């Protein structure tokens, strides 16, 4: 018979999750029919599958991952005998190992107040503490003045995300807060946000 | 393909500003502008005195 | 003849740009008889190889 043995069990080398997107990383292939790539990915119950013809790459790119959920992911190697008829009955296949994850929860804020230390001579300068919660490889928080409509998201604190945050100079008034994420995944041109 | 090249941070406007308060002057703050491109940036300064 | 086919269409992966230094990621290659890899930069009207 034509010697179209199954592709090789194939590995996730590693993976990264982000908001939405999420970098997967998978092993190399020796097949010469093999021609596809294949992913089933499963929350809850249902398994969505993720085709890609292209195999010179060692990495996969998914999206529309919803941030702050657990997935299932499942991956494979078709060939152009195997159909896609045998992809969703998974027969013939040398299906890679079930691995579970967790997307990146956005970061919010939870509590914010400043504080002004009292010095004894006069005031001492307030510095705003902010309470957050969610993941971000860094964070950048702007404030508009609310006394002016026209006020702009003035930059306060860029920098990493952190649960605490101290930070000082802002002019005594009445402002509203924002916060955005950012995360940038290995390739270093490829970043994702968690909005505002 | 088409790219281009990262441009390098240069100081645009340099100021320092001290916020006035009531009990005496408030600690000065150096507001800089700045363009270019760079993952972190490092600023020194000398005295000329 | 000899099968010496020409290489399959590379594709650049990814390509990460610096000031001076820059990234260029490329795909796979197949052929036994490939050795060496070139490259074309055009700026301009130029192109270097």
């Given at each position: 018979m034509i010697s179209n043995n199954a592709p090789a069990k194939m590995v996730l080398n590693s993976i990264m999750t982000g908001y939405t997107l999420a970098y997967v990383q998978h092993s190399i292939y020796t097949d010469y029919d093999v021609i596809g790539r294949s992913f089933w990915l499963k929350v809850e119950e249902s398994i969505d599958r993720r085709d890609y013809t292209?195999?010179?790459?060692f990495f996969v790119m998914i999206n529309n991952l919803t941030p702050s959920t657990s997935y299932e992911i499942q991956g494979a190697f078709y060939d152009s005998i195997i159909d896609s008829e045998l992809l969703e009955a998974k027969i013939g296949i040398n299906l890679s190992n079930e691995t579970n994850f967790r997307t990146k929860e956005k970061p919010i804020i939870v509590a914010a107040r400043s504080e002004s230390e009292p010095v004894d001579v006069g005031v001492g300068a307030p510095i705003v503490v902010v309470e957050t919660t969610g993941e971000a490889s860094y964070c950048t928080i702007e404030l508009k003045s609310t006394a002016s409509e026209d006020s702009e998201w003035v930059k306060y604190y860029i920098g990493a995300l952190g649960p605490t945050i101290k930070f000082g100079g802002v002019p005594v008034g009445d402002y509203k807060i924002r916060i955005s994420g950012q995360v940038t995944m290995p390739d270093g041109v490829t970043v994702d946000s968690s909005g505002y």
């Amino acid at each position: 018979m034509i010697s179209n043995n199954a592709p090789a069990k194939m590995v996730l080398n590693s993976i990264m999750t982000g908001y939405t997107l999420a970098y997967v990383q998978h092993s190399i292939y020796t097949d010469y029919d093999v021609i596809g790539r294949s992913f089933w990915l499963k929350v809850e119950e249902s398994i969505d599958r993720r085709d890609y013809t292209g195999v010179d790459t060692f990495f996969v790119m998914i999206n529309n991952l919803t941030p702050s959920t657990s997935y299932e992911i499942q991956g494979a190697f078709y060939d152009s005998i195997i159909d896609s008829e045998l992809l969703e009955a998974k027969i013939g296949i040398n299906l890679s190992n079930e691995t579970n994850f967790r997307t990146k929860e956005k970061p919010i804020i939870v509590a914010a107040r400043s504080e002004s230390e009292p010095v004894d001579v006069g005031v001492g300068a307030p510095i705003v503490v902010v309470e957050t919660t969610g993941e971000a490889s860094y964070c950048t928080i702007e404030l508009k003045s609310t006394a002016s409509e026209d006020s702009e998201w003035v930059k306060y604190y860029i920098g990493a995300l952190g649960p605490t945050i101290k930070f000082g100079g802002v002019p005594v008034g009445d402002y509203k807060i924002r916060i955005s994420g950012q995360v940038t995944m290995p390739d270093g041109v490829t970043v994702d946000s968690s909005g505002y």
